[PDB]
Swiss-Prot record, chains A, B:
It comes from the Bacteria. Coiled coil: none annotated. Pfam families: SnoaL_3 (PF13474). InterPro entries: NTF2-like_dom_sf (IPR032710), SnoaL-like (IPR037401). This is Uncharacterized protein YybH. SUPFAM superfamilies: NTF2-like.
Length: 119, 119
């Protein structure tokens, strides 16, 4: 439930560090959407794969990300995840996963900015 | 697109003022989830109907909040809506709609609090 999803997040978070986006795309749906940065979205597994490869080599001067509070709003088929990420300063994101027939939760909407996208 | 959803919001917003939750439940999915207030969620059309009937009076509507910026992250089947509501002070919510076979977008996750649910 709240764990397997939290385990998929980490699984992906790692798949990104190991720069093996080939295994990272197994967690995304085919028509998924990923918000790279404000006013910049990638649609489809291919476009999203490229986005990660592009923004692969980027880092913040002295920064220590840390998983924080995480709420899950499950509505049967889909699930809205509100993941807070601590910097030392926080980053509240909104992810949407959809459980396919196989029973594996894939990501459909990846907006690491959450409602911050508005402001 | 961005309008029909915005028109569904208003449609519901009104269905609530006219206290005719019978027509309001036509906009929600069957296994939908509604966040009434922090640490309080209603699951299923029935529970959600009761929730609205209960807080019919707890919340003084008529206080028509002003619609503001609204971002839509569509991923084929589902759609993540980031609606900002102005008070005069703002309220950034996160709604999730899913387009059924009939082609009508229903609400599956109604969290008028957005990422604020975390903090």
């Amino acid at each position: 439930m709240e764990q397997q999803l939290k385990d998929i997040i980490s699984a992906c978070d790692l798949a990104i560090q190991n720069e093996d986006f080939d295994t990272l795309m197994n967690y995304y749906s085919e028509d998924a959407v990923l918000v790279v940065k404000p006013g910049m979205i990638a649609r489809g597994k291919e476009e999203i794969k490229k986005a990660f490869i592009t923004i692969a080599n980027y880092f913040n001067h002295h920064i220590v990300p840390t998983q924080g509070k995480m709420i899950l709003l499950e509505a049967g088929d889909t699930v809205l995840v509100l993941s807070q990420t601590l910097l030392d300063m926080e980053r509240r994101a909104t992810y949407v996963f959809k459980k396919n027939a196989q029973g594996e939760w894939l990501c459909v909407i990846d907006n690491s900015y959450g409602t911050d996208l508005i402001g």
